[PDB]
Amino acid sequence: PVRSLNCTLRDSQQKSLVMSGPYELKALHLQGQDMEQQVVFSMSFVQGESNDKIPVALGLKEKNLYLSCVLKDDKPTLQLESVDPKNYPKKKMEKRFVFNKIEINNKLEFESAQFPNWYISTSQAENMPVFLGGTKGGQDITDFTMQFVSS
Ligand SMILES: *Cc1ccc(-c2cc(C(=O)O)cn3cc(C(=O)N4CCN(S(=O)(=O)c5ccccc5)CC[C@H]4C(=O)NCCN4CCOCC4)nc23)cc1C(F)(F)F
């Protein structure tokens, strides 16, 4: 059976991720405000055996949605894809749903398996969408921490 855990994520500047309507996630500082707004992910361990990366899929807990990477105008793009809850999650997830989780300096990166060198990213600015970016180590933020909830 596919192994999965429940968790929340925060970017390296402590912005939490929230659902911004049906089609996207946004990142903002929820300190001082109720953290019940943050998305709870169901991170599943999928097939990819890689050396220093762990292939995972990121589902939105109790919402039938998965983070996916699709090409739009020659640019890899992060989308929320609706799925049949009976068929998901699965050990062999489609490549568009797969992210290679990379541990680096006590933080996590999520690189698209479909589009190498593109990562789950947040802006330094408040309340901007979570997106797939192709720069790392600049202004855009590709480092996260997981707050483990349950297995
Ligand atoms: C990639 C990965 C997968 C799974 C886990 C993991 C697995 C289990 C389990 O199988 O039982 C348990 N568990 C607990 C924690 C955990 O305590 N964490 C999450 C991991 N991190 S981190 O993401 O910041 C990190 C990543 C990489 C290297 C170092 C650190 C540390 C934070 C911590 C946590 O959740 N603390 C919350 C405590 N807090 C106290 C107050 O009340 C609210 C809760 N992970 C797992 C781990 C990982 C890996 F990311 F690699 F760590």
Side-chain angles (χ1 to χ4, degrees):
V2 51
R3 180 167 76 100
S4 77
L5 54 87
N6 291 172
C7 69
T8 62
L9 297 168
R10 275 195 176 62
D11 69 30
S12 70
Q13 299 190 338
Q14 307 310 320
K15 285 202 301 306
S16 302
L17 308 181
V18 302
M19 185 101 75
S20 184
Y23 313 103
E24 82 187 357
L25 301 180
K26 279 185 173 183
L28 76 165
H29 282 96
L30 293 171
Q31 292 89 350
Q33 295 99 63
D34 222 322
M35 278 68 61
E36 294 167 358
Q37 315 175 20
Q38 73 191 323
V39 176
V40 170
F41 291 96
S42 180
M43 190 176 85
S44 311
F45 295 92
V46 311
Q47 300 195 340
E49 227 199 339
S50 181
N51 254 335
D52 289 307
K53 306 178 187 211
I54 299 174
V56 302
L58 292 160
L60 279 62
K61 189 193 170 170
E62 292 171 2
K63 277 272 180 216
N64 301 328
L65 302 180
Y66 270 87
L67 269 58
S68 59
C69 308
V70 298
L71 202 62
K72 261 160 59 168
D73 275 300
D74 202 32
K75 183 220 183 65
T77 297
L78 188 64
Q79 291 297 121
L80 295 185
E81 179 172 338
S82 194
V83 299
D84 193 348
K86 304 184 165 28
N87 309 331
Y88 290 85
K90 48 182 182 190
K91 295 183 296 184
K92 298 181 175 174
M93 283 282 200
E94 291 81 3
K95 215 170 196 179
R96 75 189 175 273
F97 305 113
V98 184
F99 295 93
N100 293 123
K101 190 186 66 172
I102 306 178
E103 180 265 346
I104 176 103
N105 299 126
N106 301 329
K107 289 186 194 73
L108 305 171
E109 287 178 347
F110 296 95
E111 182 182 3
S112 174
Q114 183 93 100
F115 305 102
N117 304 309
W118 285 74
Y119 299 85
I120 296 183
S121 305
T122 62
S123 296
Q124 307 217 109
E126 294 299 312
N127 212 35
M128 298 297 295
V130 174
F131 63 102
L132 218 64
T135 72
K136 169 176 59 83
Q139 289 188 349
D140 297 332
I141 295 158
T142 55
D143 296 340
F144 299 85
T145 56
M146 162 210 302
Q147 296 80 51
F148 178 87
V149 181
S150 55
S151 238

